[PDB]
Point group: C2
Chain length 89, copies 2
């Protein structure tokens, strides 16, 4: 129910160079697969969200097909990345 404090902390201050696993919805195991995919930092992943014009269906299929994230974990990344943009873009 309550997103971990990271969700509010992430949309409360710049993302700087924090690691991908810092994004809400991405756990240490999942952050590792994206890292092997060339996404060693969160701003490279945010770029993907920007390239998908916030298409939620395209984003969710991209993350799931890219690492195998579940429907629950994709929802946290969508609202988490979408809310950061609302404050920083």
């Amino acid at each position: 129910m309550t997103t971990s404090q990271k969700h509010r902390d992430f949309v409360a201050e710049p993302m700087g160079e924090k690691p991908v696993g810092s994004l809400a919805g991405i756990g240490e195991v999942l952050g590792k697969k994206l890292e092997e995919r060339g996404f060693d930092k969160a701003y490279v992943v945010l770029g993907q969200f920007l390239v998908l014009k916030k298409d939620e269906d395209l984003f969710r299929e991209w993350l799931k097909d890219t690492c195998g994230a579940n429907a629950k974990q994709s929802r946290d990344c969508f609202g988490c990345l979408r809310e950061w943009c609302d404050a920083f873009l």
Copy 2:
């Protein structure tokens, strides 16, 4: 010598949904080729800059091979996109 007022105006306020041709260094003819390439808005182009980890050589070759921009026009987009990130990312 003096970048047009757009350069300072762009890094002085959010980019919102302004058209790609709004980025400094991209003229109306060049903005049109990127638009045919699927970049109808500036935030989709900024995403590409984020995906290239600000690699200036990779970015310049990408824009030139993508539309044919000259060495002068690529310099304006690099410093223009890079400075916006310094203020908004």
